[PDB]
Design a binder for this molecule. Structure first.
Ligand SMILES: [Cu+2]
Length: 464
């Protein structure tokens, strides 16, 4: 509760409607020990790219690594050609430009690499940034809006380090099964930082940027969170909660009341997921310390945020079934290594590189599974019947509606605009529409956002 919370620079267009992102390596320090890290416009993580609905921007992307990478805009409704999936290679030393014509509601999205079979490693190395989409609707609401004062991004990620201090990442049979997770928790790159927040309302834009660890946010003194937005933007009205589960890649925006001068913690609560309840995550774990201060803020919590469209009628819509599966050998072999390495705490609460799949096929980049309709709602049925793993299933090129999440209607705060849906040993249904095109050369991806599962096959391509 000591270093101040790092705040990503809010990056806007220049006079020529361009934005420069440089992808480079550098050095970060975690707990006294230095580590090689990757970042956008810096050594670690990245900026918050600010975009206005209905305004085009060109982004110039400079790969200053010595290996290939891609830049995917997670949550953005844009054509496949700029979507930055594994076919959007930026060679080392190379420069690629993309045009983003933003046409979707205000939201906190994010961007990260999407290299073929290396997404987990590139994100673990430090690469992630934010996208703040604004529109006319949101600025009329009088929410907390002072960036890095009462409107603050909170990117929570776990990492594991070697004895030398270097990030200890590996795509092996255990991580291919259960995911890459660590024992150290970072908040905008820092360990248990403090943020100084004005009395009144504090707005937190939460991002679970872990490779595989699911989270569950609360406060130390159990004051509520007022959920105001999901992956794809504002909810119709606030949802007041005591805790907030957040899957890998999901974003929620919450308001928290800063009503006295007593400091408290934003925390994450222990979750039931293979590997994730191992100490120190067997108990509530602090994310950041919040320190009330008496400086000016005028943000507020409205009664009503937005009006969303109704769910479409289901009659006549195309149904697409996506069956997620793991090779049994991976499951057991991965489970053995987990039990070997950690023991009984691990469950508290044959090429493995193509062992994870959808409709019995490990991802093949030259063969898109189908062409989805443009401008027409479809019903996608995603089943995890057959294993007990957690699958936060993400679909590019869209913000959808969850019709059913793992056997029930979605929770109220998950019933708005989402690009991620929980699949865990059951079936989920989403109502999805694609407003933009994606040819086979720049196909959209649908995949599990437990990145090691993605990297080892749990992904498909599709065209629109
Ligand atoms: Cu998965």
């Amino acid at each position: 509760e000591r270093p101040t919370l790092p705040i990503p620079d809010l990056l806007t267009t220049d006079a020529r409607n361009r934005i420069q992102l440089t992808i480079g390596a550098g050095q970060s320090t975690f707990g006294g020990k230095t580590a090689t890290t990757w970042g956008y416009n810096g050594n670690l993580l990245g900026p918050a790219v600010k975009l206005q609905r209905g305004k085009a921007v060109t982004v110039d992307i400079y790969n200053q690594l010595t290996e290939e990478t891609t830049l995917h805009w997670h949550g953005l409704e844009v054509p496949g050609e700029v979507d930055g999936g594994p076919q959007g290679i930026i060679p080392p030393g190379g420069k690629r430009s993309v045009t983003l014509n933003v046409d979707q509601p205000a939201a906190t999205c994010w961007f990260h690499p999407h290299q073929h079979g290396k997404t987990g490693r590139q994100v673990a190395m430090g690469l992630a940034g934010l996208v703040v989409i604004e529109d006319d609707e949101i600025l009329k609401l009088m929410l907390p809006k002072q960036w890095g004062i009462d409107d603050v991004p909170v990117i929570v990620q776990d990492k594991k380090f070697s004895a030398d201090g270097q990030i200890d990442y590996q795509l092996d049979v255990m991580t291919a099964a259960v995911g890459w997770f660590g024992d150290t928790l970072l908040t905008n790159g820092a360990i248990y930082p403090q943020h100084a927040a004005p009395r009144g309302w504090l707005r937190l834009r939460l991002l679970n940027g872990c490779n595989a660890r699911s989270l569950n946010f609360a406060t130390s003194d159990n004051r509520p969170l007022y959920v105001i937005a999901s992956d794809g933007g504002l909810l119709p009205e606030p949802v007041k909660v005591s805790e907030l589960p957040v899957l890998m890649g999901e974003r929620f925006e919450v308001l928290v009341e800063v009503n006295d001068n007593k400091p408290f913690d934003l925390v994450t609560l222990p979750v039931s997921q293979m590997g994730m309840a191992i100490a120190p995550f067997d108990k509530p774990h602090p994310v950041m310390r919040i320190q009330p201060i008496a400086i000016s803020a005028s943000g507020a919590l409205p009664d009503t945020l937005s009006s969303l469209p109704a769910l479409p009628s289901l009659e006549g819509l195309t149904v697409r079934k996506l069956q997620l599966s793991m090779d049994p050998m991976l499951d057991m072999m991965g489970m053995q290594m987990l039990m070997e390495k950690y023991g009984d705490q691990a469950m508290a609460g044959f090429d493995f590189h193509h062992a994870n799949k959808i409709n019995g096929q490990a991802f093949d980049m030259n063969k898109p599974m189908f062409a989805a309709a443009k401008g027409q709602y479809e019903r996608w049925v995603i089943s995890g019947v057959g294993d007990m793993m957690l699958h936060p299933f993400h679909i590019h090129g869209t913000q959808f509606r969850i019709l059913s999440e793992n056997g029930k209607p979605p929770a109220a705060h998950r019933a708005g605009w989402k690009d991620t849906v929980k699949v865990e040993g059951n079936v989920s249904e989403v109502l999805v529409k694609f407003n933009h095109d994606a040819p086979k050369e720049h196909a959209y991806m649908a995949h599990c956002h437990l990145l090691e599962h993605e990297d080892t096959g749990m992904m498909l391509g599709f065209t629109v």
